[PDB]
Design a binder for this molecule. Sequence first.
Ligand SMILES: [Cl-]
Ligand SMILES: [Cl-]
Lengths: 291, 291
Amino acid sequence: MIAGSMVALVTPFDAQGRLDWDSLAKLVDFHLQEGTNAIVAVGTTGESATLDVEEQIQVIRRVVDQVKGRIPVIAGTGANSTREAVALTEAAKSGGADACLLVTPYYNKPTQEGMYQHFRHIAEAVAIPQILYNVPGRTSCDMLPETVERLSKVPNIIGIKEATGDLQRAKEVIERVGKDFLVYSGDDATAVELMLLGGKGNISVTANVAPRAMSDLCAAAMRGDAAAARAINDRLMPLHKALFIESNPIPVKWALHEMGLIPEGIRLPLTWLSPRCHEPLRQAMRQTGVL
Amino acid sequence: MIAGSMVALVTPFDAQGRLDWDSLAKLVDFHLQEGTNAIVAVGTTGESATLDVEEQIQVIRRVVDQVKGRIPVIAGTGANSTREAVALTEAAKSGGADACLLVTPYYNKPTQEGMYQHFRHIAEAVAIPQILYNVPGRTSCDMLPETVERLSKVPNIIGIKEATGDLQRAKEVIERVGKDFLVYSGDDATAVELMLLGGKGNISVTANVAPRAMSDLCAAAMRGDAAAARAINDRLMPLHKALFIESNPIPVKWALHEMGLIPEGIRLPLTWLSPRCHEPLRQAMRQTGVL
Ligand SMILES: [Cl-]
Ligand SMILES: [Cl-]
């Protein structure tokens, strides 16, 4: 199932900024062990912006090859050029990804019709399931529910990552699209509520550091055990907040390094988590039992 | 000197979306004849997002080669990866641009310190004058005055395109930087007020279709002739508004096609200006005497 707790996996780098393959393999094994339901490679949290095209397909291939079909691997292949998006999605398909996640074009602010044309083109150009990704707080453009609705009728577009953390928006999307068209959260704090509304997973930053709890949270929320799901979520809340104390993935990378899982590399223009933030994050990690 | 009316030049394409060199040569001639003080090639209005790296240097070289030193040519070389920004800026210098215009990283939301490190790195890596470009409405991040002030002290960073249209911001930036550090407008409607505050130019969409008027506007503003500058701006205002009726450069490309200057190509995910917007824009062009 392309559903449940789907980790938005970081891309580990050594201090020089080179890909750390060993650390990546360790993260994959961690996820397979702790109950994560799908891995999203080279998305926002995986620093897609600072990876070149060749590095991106390499990350995807290494993850695909290690996972060996045990859980779905989703490739972040979005771009603000339709031609570029087709190229990335094609690479990801040949590299054996199960599905691709495509952010709405950032920076260039396409019209609603332009977004339709973009996503519909990629959907017809490359025969791999595709998942939309709306994150206005990053792209500077908002794919409205009616546009999501029109795209939900396009063969090969199978779902949407809704990252606004606006639960009225979530509800409206869920009501407008078909039951086969899966709505996933991209906001850790509110994901539980999104799933209780009928959403079918969470593409999670927190799952990087608490995969078991997040896989438990999603399983509970998706079978309608609101009180159990909410109890896990309420417990995790200090951690959800602290992982955003600076722009993601700066905090989560610091957290994974503190846990001994990845080296201290992050690519400019991202910087290593500020000293003033170490304590708040560290004790949210202690409090939730990840450290 | 890099100052006055600086056109954010479109990049013309045929109906198949291929680069149209003849059209580009016509645009450059138009600007050389009509009093334009500088050309910005392959920036936001130039659809940098949908041009590949090879196409980008091609446009810059063709513009540089035709201008032959008559006015400054500024290349858009911004990226959300510091490594990529270096590659583009390096290519531009080698292609003969007089300066580079570099947008703050879009989408990945660096910290203020991350922005300082990004721009300081590019400034030290490539010996070409560099102009910062703050456009929070597209990048999803805002370079605050304090950061602008810090970067204004870095060798090779000579100015900033302040695109917020916030005149309190402009005033604050102007007060904080050196007199040698040039603040240019990136907002056509308010550019006159920015220049009256001490700003030294306008990197203009409107100058694409009304270069002489915009040239005249900038001259009057920069010499402190407020009544004259305001008079030109008031006359142009219906055009300033209509050129943003859909995301730039969708309107200005429709305008230039209507004026016979470029073919009807625009690259996905941008779309040709919507029918319902034709009348408002055409009427604005008629009223201002552009048509
Ligand atoms: Cl964030
Ligand atoms: Cl716009």
